[PDB]
């Protein structure tokens, strides 16, 4: 299986409007070697996908958001499911690949009473601790804290790319307009000017938060290349007996 294989079928898998959904497992199958993917916990907390695959014959760990199930939102179960998989992959020198399409954290009294804060911290900590190579690709959305929970550059990420349909924002364009232009209350033009500058990956790109805006069809050909370079990655951290996971 050549490492330079093109994947044109991913060039239009993301629907035009953010309202529709798509299957992330299709992207994962199109990207990995021979489309062979060993999914872990496939039936539990289905709004997140974790598994083992191969890139250029090297074992890799795949994490991603599933827009089909629960809109791709993060909750307690998905956070706990992802955190331990990431920790195991980091403990045994296995690279991590992340596909990001997440609108935010699931709200409600149930999530707060169950302690969504602790488990979201679990996932954030798991991604921040990793010293293995990590590659992130943002497909459609990254809003709120879920943006940097899902292996952002600011957690010592290695390479991050954005598809042309990426949407990186602090929070929803509307709610941002009313919270910023509260006195203006002229969303007719306020939203139009907001969706022209911030409803696009250009802000994070010009700040350098993403390395490059790549065509989807080159995804695999990029990732393999990165995994060939990052194989010698070594980082140093302050000494400690062990850290304090927020368990």
């Amino acid at each position: 299986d050549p490492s330079d294989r093109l994947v044109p079928e991913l060039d239009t898998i993301v629907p035009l409007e953010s309202t529709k959904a798509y299957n992330m497992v299709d992207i994962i199958h199109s990207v990995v070697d021979e489309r062979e993917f060993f999914e872990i916990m496939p039936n539990y907390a289905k709004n997140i996908i974790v598994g083992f695959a191969r890139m250029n014959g090297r074992t890799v760990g795949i994490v991603g958001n599933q827009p089909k199930v629960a809109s791709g939102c993060l909750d307690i179960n998905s956070s706990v499911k992802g955190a331990r998989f990431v920790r195991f992959c980091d403990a045994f020198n296995i690279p991590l690949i992340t596909f990001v399409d997440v609108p935010g954290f699931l709200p409600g009294t149930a999530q707060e009473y169950g302690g969504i804060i602790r488990h979201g911290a679990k996932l954030l900590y798991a991604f921040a601790e990793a010293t293995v190579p990590k590659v992130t690709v943002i497909t459609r959305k990254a809003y709120g804290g879920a943006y940097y929970v899902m292996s952002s550059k600011h957690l010592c990420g290695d390479t991050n790319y954005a598809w042309p349909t990426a949407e990186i924002a602090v929070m929803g364009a509307k709610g941002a307009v009313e919270i910023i232009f509260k006195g203006h209350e002229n969303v007719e033009a306020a939203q139009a000017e907001y969706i022209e500058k911030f409803a696009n990956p250009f802000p994070a790109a010009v700040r350098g938060f993403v390395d490059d805006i790549i065509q989807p069809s080159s995804t695999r050909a990029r990732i393999c290349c990165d995994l060939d370079v990052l194989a010698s990655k070594k980082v140093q951290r302050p000494w400690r007996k062990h850290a304090n996971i927020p368990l």
Binding site: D1, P2, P8, E9, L10, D11, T12, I13, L16, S18, T19, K20, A21, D26, H29, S30, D33, E34, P67, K68, V69, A70, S71, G72, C73, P103, G104, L106, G108, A110, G172
Partner: protein, 673 residues
């Protein structure tokens, strides 16, 4: 392809798919700026990116995007277009489009409105043919208005009487009847179905020719009163009165019949004053008696195949004629060059109803363009999804050669080397049709698919030698996968000791039988003993390429591996048919004998809401029979709608929730069977 002559600078193509791609290609070959229309869904199709520029016409449905005349008019107005090509279908027969189009300076590339209105209706075409002193089906003249009239006419016009609703088309509104009671009941049924579908309410009743050959003559009329017949074609292989496999040089027909039919078609075209490309369909019986059926007044779909035996670009000649130039060819210049056979590859399941439309998204798509003598016409690229709004057809595959046998062999090779993954297609049907003994011999009628497979499409019944070849190939693939799994990079801390197993003793379960296989590996050679018979398999054993070529006992085979599980299940496409084989080791089979059967009943009758939210819409009601993949109740939740689907094929027992209702997580929404 002379570019010196002046021709229209701007052409708009009012179609989509393969035909739009073909017109764009032939316009680029002759130096014409092209315009392509497209709906919102098809905004990234092949013909849009191949065109110089494109104009969106409207929403997804064809009744609002490509059938919207006003959008086409404004698109032509803005783009300064000079000509328009309708391809086939859609507005190619629209008189209103023709008149509003001729209202301005732009010209319609095709036949005149007079021919369109003459041939749109069936009875007028039949009476014109009668006035054209050409052979026709003996049938009633006019429209039958009562069942009693139907039966009294059926007394004399023949016991095997066919009733056809006037106008319309597409294979509907046609039905065969035997008895007078059959005559009257078919009359009434045709009446209400024509009212519902066509709305014309006019019925044409005529004799049904038994076991006919659907021959077709391609004519190229011009503006100077010249008609040329471009040989013949055969479309006998039909499904629901829709053609699937075609052959340009018809073997049953001979030179004298060819000349007679060509002269008849030319005379009919001159009578109708046709001034573009078209086709005439005849039903040749056993005794070489043909009768006029329909003269298609547009670019016929099966046009490319005759090109392979003539060498003339039909679209180019249509454009040149529309300009006004005289025909550059003579009747004597037309001849037969080699052989050409083509098949239409649809996105349908051939196992059910001989092909029923399916939907999906194409994850993998590759055509055998590298194979010799193969032409592929397709508006399909990887990532293209098959929808319900349009014709569920993938591509058209044409093979040309010196003679019939070479063309059929190349067609079989091309079908074996065709990669489609994402939807279900009818490649198995086409390959079995081309390799059928009757098809090779030459005994074909319009009932080929019906009589050859009476109980339905079942798959390629493979013989003993073919079964041994398949088992050997599957076992060799299994052993190759194991050997690849044994290969690791050097560790230098815990060295790997590769096992020295020489013989692999496998149990291969196929269909229902179980076979014992002994496989041995020597380099790239696999010596496989299946039930005593010894075979040798050699290949490069590339486990990642979608197409794998092997050589079993000298015979070269091309197979695909569409699925593979660690349990032992494997789906392999061999000779066009997908076979499921379960491969285990002998010890694994002996231990599996103890395993108990797992009964799988499940529930799949309770639907749970993923989160609290407002159900945007519900498309089901209690008592709706639904299957897997169909959305049940789309729920809007936090600027995102989830189209939740049923787990199994069961009738909807109850829809507890309704549209515009707010629910919590895991509430009672839908109960199924």
């Amino acid at each position: 392809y002379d570019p010196n002559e002046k021709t229209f600078d701007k052409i708009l193509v009012a179609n989509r798919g393969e035909i739009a791609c073909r017109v764009i290609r032939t316009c680029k070959k002759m130096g014409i700026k092209t315009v392509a229309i497209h709906s919102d869904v098809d905004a990234s199709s092949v013909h849009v990116k191949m065109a110089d520029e494109a104009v969106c016409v409207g929403p997804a449905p064809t009744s609002k995007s490509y059938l919207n005349m006003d959008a086409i008019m404004e698109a032509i107005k803005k783009t300064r277009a000079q000509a328009v090509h309708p391809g086939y279908g859609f507005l190619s027969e629209n008189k209103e489009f023709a008149r509003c189009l001729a209202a301005e300076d732009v010209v319609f590339i095709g036949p005149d409105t007079h021919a369109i209105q003459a041939m749109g209706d069936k009875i007028e075409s039949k009476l014109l043919a009668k006035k054209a002193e050409v052979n026709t089906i003996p049938g009633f003249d006019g429209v039958v208005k009562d069942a009693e009239e139907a039966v009294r006419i059926a007394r004399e016009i023949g016991y095997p009487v066919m009733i056809k609703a006037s106008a319309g088309g597409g294979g509907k509104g046609m039905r065969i009847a035997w008895d007078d009671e059959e005559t009257r009941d078919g009359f009434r049924l045709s009446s209400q179905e024509a009212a519902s579908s066509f709305g014309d309410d006019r019925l044409l009743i005529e004799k049904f020719i038994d076991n006919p050959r659907h021959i077709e003559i391609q004519v190229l009329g011009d503006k100077h009163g010249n008609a040329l017949w471009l040989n013949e074609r055969e479309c006998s292989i039909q499904r629901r009165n829709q053609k699937v496999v075609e052959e340009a040089p018809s073997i049953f027909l001979d030179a004298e019949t060819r000349r007679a039919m060509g002269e008849q078609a030319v005379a009919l075209a001159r009578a109708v004053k046709y001034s573009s490309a078209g086709t005439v369909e005849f039903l040749v019986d056993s005794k070489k008696n043909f009768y006029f059926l329909e003269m298609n007044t547009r670019l016929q779909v099966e046009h490319p195949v005759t090109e392979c035996i003539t060498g003339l670009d039909l679209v180019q000649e249509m454009i040149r004629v529309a300009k006004g130039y005289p025909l550059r060819h003579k009747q004597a210049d037309i001849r037969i060059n080699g052989w050409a056979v083509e098949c239409r590859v649809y996105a349908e399941d051939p196992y059910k109803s001989f092909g029923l439309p399916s939907i999906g998204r194409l994850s993998q798509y590759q055509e055998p363009l590298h194979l010799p003598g193969v032409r592929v016409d397709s508006g399909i690229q990887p990532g293209s999804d098959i929808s319900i709004y349009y014709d569920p057809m993938i591509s058209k595959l044409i093979t040309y050669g010196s003679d019939r046998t070479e063309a059929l062999k190349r067609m079989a090779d091309a079908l074996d080397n065709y990669v489609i993954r994402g939807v279900t297609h009818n490649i198995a049907l086409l390959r079995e049709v081309i390799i059928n003994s009757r098809f090779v011999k030459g005994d074909i009628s319009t009932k080929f698919l019906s009589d050859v497979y009476p109980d339905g499409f079942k798959g390629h019944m493979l013989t003993k030698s073919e079964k041994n070849q398949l088992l050997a190939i599957a076992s060799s693939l299994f052993v190759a996968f194991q050997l690849r799994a044994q290969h690791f990079q050097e560790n230098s801390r815990m060295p790997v000791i590769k096992p020295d197993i020489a013989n692999w003793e496998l149990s291969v379960k196929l269909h229902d039988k179980v076979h014992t296989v002994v496989a041995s590996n020597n380099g790239s050679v696999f010596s496989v003993e299946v039930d005593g018979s010894k075979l040798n398999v050699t290949s490069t054993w590339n486990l990642a390429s979608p197409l794998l070529s092997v050589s079993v006992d000298g015979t070269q085979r091309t197979v695909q591996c569409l699925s593979r599980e660690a349990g032992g299940n494997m789906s392999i496409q061999f000779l066009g048919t997908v076979y499921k084989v379960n491969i285990l080791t002998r010890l694994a089979a002996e231990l599996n004998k103890f395993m108990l059967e797992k009964v799988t009943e499940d529930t799949s009758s309770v639907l749970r809401s993923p989160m609290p939210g407002v159900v945007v819409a519900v498309s089901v009601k209690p008592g709706d029979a639904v299957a897997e993949g169909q959305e049940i109740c789309v729920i809007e939740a936090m600027k995102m709608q989830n189209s939740m689907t049923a787990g199994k094929t069961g009738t909807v027992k109850s829809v507890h929730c309704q549209a515009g209702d707010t629910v919590g997580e895991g509430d009672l929404l839908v109960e199924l069977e």
